[PDB]
Design a protein around this ligand. Structure first.
Ligand SMILES: [Mg+2]
Ligand SMILES: [Mg+2]
Ligand SMILES: [Mg+2]
Ligand SMILES: [Mg+2]
Ligand SMILES: [Mg+2]
Ligand SMILES: [Mg+2]
Ligand SMILES: [Mg+2]
Ligand SMILES: [Mg+2]
Ligand SMILES: [Mg+2]
Ligand SMILES: [Mg+2]
Ligand SMILES: [Mg+2]
Ligand SMILES: [Mg+2]
Ligand SMILES: [Mg+2]
Ligand SMILES: [Zn+2]
Lengths: 135, 119, 48, 76, 73, 175
RNA sequence: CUGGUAGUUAUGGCGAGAAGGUCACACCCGUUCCCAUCCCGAACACGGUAGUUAAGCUUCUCUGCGCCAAUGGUAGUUGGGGGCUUCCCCCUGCGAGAGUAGGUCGCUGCCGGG
RNA sequence: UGGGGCGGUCGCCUCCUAAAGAGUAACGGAGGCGCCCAAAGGUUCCCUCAGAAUGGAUGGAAAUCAUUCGCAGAGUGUAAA
RNA sequence: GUCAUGGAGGUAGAGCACUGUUUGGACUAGGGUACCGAAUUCAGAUAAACUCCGAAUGCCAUGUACUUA
């Protein structure tokens, strides 16, 4: 699973996800891509599952791109611990995706199997998506 | 293929080091010195207005004498002070110009002090 | 190692200044020429 | 089950202390800073810890020196 | 050039052992020998084996008999 | 100035009309000669640091000056400050007599004399040299030197490319 | 025409090519003294012009780099009002960053000579 | 003191939170201090770093030498600004 | 309080010019070809403790302005 090799600080703020995507709002590498319509956090587990289900249908033919990466980390507390006494220990890694950001790319396959592969990927992500193509 | 260090450029770098602490005003102007490999020049400047008041150099139509060009600075220093006194100037500050206050520039400064110039 | 010292006028004999020194760097007694208010002139001072 | 943080210093109240165009008494402080964010101009001196004060009575004028620097001056 | 630091560099002539050409050089040692070389001026002389005689660009033990025989003083 | 006689009266006139230089001011000429020892054993061999210093002087006559390290490296337990090498700057008329002890005396003396490297140029107009045994100079004493160190000799010329730089020294004389 | 000496946010810089010169300015020669190098008259210091425009310097050309820079649109946002409230929409005022049309191989002051 | 106890903390300096003047809390996120220097202070004069490539060396990736490029990519007694 | 004028300050936004994080290609001077010690370059992302930039408001002050206590 995609994790950073090392980080400067182990703890980070939750942040916010308001506004349009700063960059990457268009397809540049492949010819089809999944575009987010809403905004939500995407963990690294959902990136992996949406990728195996995406290359398995393509039978390992053609190249896919991952346009997002889980830079930020989040923490959690055990059950039975009261509030306070510091901060929790990190658990996973997330990538806050604002609306209008392409998350995947497809090239090297015909029209029929490009849309179907993207369709199976979208069902594993918690955001409402749309299949978009280049020009 | 060692390239040669430019003489004037390095001097100008040392010129600004002193020039930070020395600036000529209207009441107390600055005495500048430019030394050449064959001559030597002196100038009186007030940096507040960027104006030259009086000057003299080892190129005028008089005092023709080239005794190893070290005492020529003494003659040059004897004219700037005389012309400064005629123009009503009393006290100045010596701008070393980036040179070393040892030889030709020392002799020019010494002559000015003897004549009508206050340091 | 780094102790406090007091300086004494060699003529008057009255302590006038306090400074510091390194014991293992200056084992001798420091001597400096400071201003003595009683005599109103610079006089040699050495550590007690 | 504990935190090793929880330490902070005391704020030093930095920043400007007089405004542009305001008449100012000599010896008064104009700008408290670390390092030299603003250089002392005319009739302005920098103290031991880089506080710009005024030497003579006049009017404070923050003004721009060469392309990437600032200075403060006092004009009678 | 500063006084009292560097050993001497007074000139000394230099010669071979087979061609014996009087060549000027600057050195701190006079080889315990001196000649009136050039136009009436007194220059020391250095003697060493063949230098630049060939430089890869020009029997009773061979030298065994010759060197010992010459060594007879 | 034996080489200077050829350098000033025989070498230079054969270059002005050889490379179509617009003036004599563009003719390449020697600038300085340097010697470097770099005996790093002085980390423990304190005496050896000054042992070769006087040895290096006798080859030139000028007093060498102690050179210290620029920083500290952990691999060779080097600490900043200790003498590492020596400097001798042959300048002025000395690029006309010191090398005469080389191109006529030194190279023929070495145990395996065959020539100099034809490619040992820095790539911009200078030439270097190497010596492997420390008793090559005509004014050295074999029994007086206990240790041997590898030297670095550099000749600096005002030549702009390796073409002319090689053929001045080639005309100056060495294999 | 040139040598000094200041102001001006690099539109003033960098790089490239050409022309010029003892009237200046430099390159250059030497080390007797003043002075000088952790050694080195390289620099500094001093004494001159045998040689030179190949360098520095001056003039000329550029858009290759750099620098400066609109108009329109957009993000954002004070005030007012709405929602289906991870957030989103409407009216009025302000209004970037990036990208771009475009400009640039400088502009003024004083003194001494030719 | 998200009940009390066990654990941790108690004074000073630096950064973020801190919402473009100043100030601003939490058992919120990161670090230091309880010194050192007789020159590591004053003044006068002078100059410029890291790193890389290239050729020669005992001597190796890295020790000292030369050239070139090099607006700080170094340094500033010590933590950060 | 509003208006006109002058300022200090790096948030929102944006950006890769520094520092961390990071994707896909050309790229393996030299170790024994990422396994690299790695570096150059093209294209594309990211940041509370990044900044070549940078607002709206807020704040400080001057005025001879108009109103108001
Ligand atoms: Mg603080
Ligand atoms: Mg101080
Ligand atoms: Mg203090
Ligand atoms: Mg600028
Ligand atoms: Mg003429
Ligand atoms: Mg004498
Ligand atoms: Mg606009
Ligand atoms: Mg703009
Ligand atoms: Mg605020
Ligand atoms: Mg504040
Ligand atoms: Mg602590
Ligand atoms: Mg305003
Ligand atoms: Mg932001
Ligand atoms: Zn006393």
């Amino acid at each position: 699973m995609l994790v950073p090799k090392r980080v400067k600080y182990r703890r980070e703020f939750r942040g916010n996800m308001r506004g349009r995507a700063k960059g990457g709002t268009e397809v540049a590498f492949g010819e089809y891509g999944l575009q987010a319509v809403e905004a939500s956090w995407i963990t690294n587990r959902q990136i992996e599952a949406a990728r195996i289900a995406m290359t398995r249908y393509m039978k390992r033919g053609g190249k896919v791109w991952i346009k997002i990466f889980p830079h930020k980390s989040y923490t959690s507390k055990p059950i039975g611990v009261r509030m306070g006494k510091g901060k929790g220990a990190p658990e996973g890694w997330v990538s806050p995706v604002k609306r209008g950001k392409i998350m995947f790319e497809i090239a090297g396959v015909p029209e029929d199997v490009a849309r179907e592969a993207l369709r199976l990927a979208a069902h594993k992500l918690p955001v409402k998506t749309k299949i978009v193509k280049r020009e | 293929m060692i390239t040669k260090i430019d003489k004037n450029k390095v001097r100008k770098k040392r010129h600004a080091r002193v020039r930070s602490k020395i600036s000529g005003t209207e009441s107390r102007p600055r005495l500048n010195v430019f030394r050449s490999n064959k001559n030597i020049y002196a100038q009186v400047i007030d940096d507040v207005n960027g104006v030259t008041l009086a000057s003299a150099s080892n190129l005028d139509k008089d005092f023709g004498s080239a005794e190893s060009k070290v005492d020529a600075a003494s003659k040059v220093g004897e004219l700037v002070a005389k012309r400064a006194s005629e123009k009503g100037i009393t006290s100045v500050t010596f701008d070393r110009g980036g040179y070393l206050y040892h030889g030709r520039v020392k002799a020019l400064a010494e002559a000015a002090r003897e004549n009508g110039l206050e340091f | 190692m780094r102790v406090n010292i007091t300086l004494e006028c060699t003529e008057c004999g009255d302590r006038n200044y306090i400074t510091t020194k390194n014991k293992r760097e200056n084992p001798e007694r420091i001597e400096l020429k400071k201003y003595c208010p009683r005599l109103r002139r610079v006089t040699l001072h050495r550590e007690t | 089950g504990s935190t090793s943080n929880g330490r902070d210093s005391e704020s030093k109240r930095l920043g400007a202390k007089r405004a542009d165009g305001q008449f100012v008494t000599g010896g008064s402080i104009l700008y408290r800073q670390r390092g030299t964010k603003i250089y002392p101009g005319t009739n302005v001196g920098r103290g031991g810890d880089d506080t710009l004060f005024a030497k003579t009575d006049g009017v404070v004028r923050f003004e721009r020196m060469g392309r990437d620097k600032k200075k403060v001056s006092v004009y009678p | 050039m500063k006084t009292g630091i560097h050993p001497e560099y007074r000139p000394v002539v230099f010669v071979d052992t087979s061609t014996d050409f009087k060549f000027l050089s600057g050195s701190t040692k006079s080889s315990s020998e001196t000649i009136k070389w050039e136009d009436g001026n007194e220059y020391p002389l250095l003697r060493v084996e063949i230098s630049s005689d060939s430089h890869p660009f020009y029997a009773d033990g061979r030298v065994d008999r010759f060197n010992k025989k010459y060594g007879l003083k | 100035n034996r080489l200077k006689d050829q350098y000033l009266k025989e070498i230079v006139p054969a270059l002005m009309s050889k490379f179509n230089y617009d003036s004599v001011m563009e003719v390449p000429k020697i600038d300085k000669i340097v010697i470097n020892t770099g005996v790093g054993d002085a980390t423990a061999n304190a005496k050896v640091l000054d042992s070769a210093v006087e040895e290096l002087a006798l080859i030139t006559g000028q007093k060498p000056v102690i050179t210290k390290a620029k920083n500290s490296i952990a691999g060779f337990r080097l600490r900043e400050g200790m003498p590492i090498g020596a400097k001798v700057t042959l300048r002025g008329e000395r690029m006309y007599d010191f090398l005469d002890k080389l191109v006529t005396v030194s190279l023929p003396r070495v145990r395996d004399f065959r020539g100099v490297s034809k490619k040992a140029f820095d790539g911009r107009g200078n030439y270097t040299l190497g010596v492997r045994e420390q008793l090559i100079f005509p004014e050295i004493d074999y029994d007086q030197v206990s240790k041997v160190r590898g030297m670095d000799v550099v000749i600096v010329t005002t030549a702009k490319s390796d073409e002319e730089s090689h053929e001045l020294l080639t005309q100056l004389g060495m294999p």
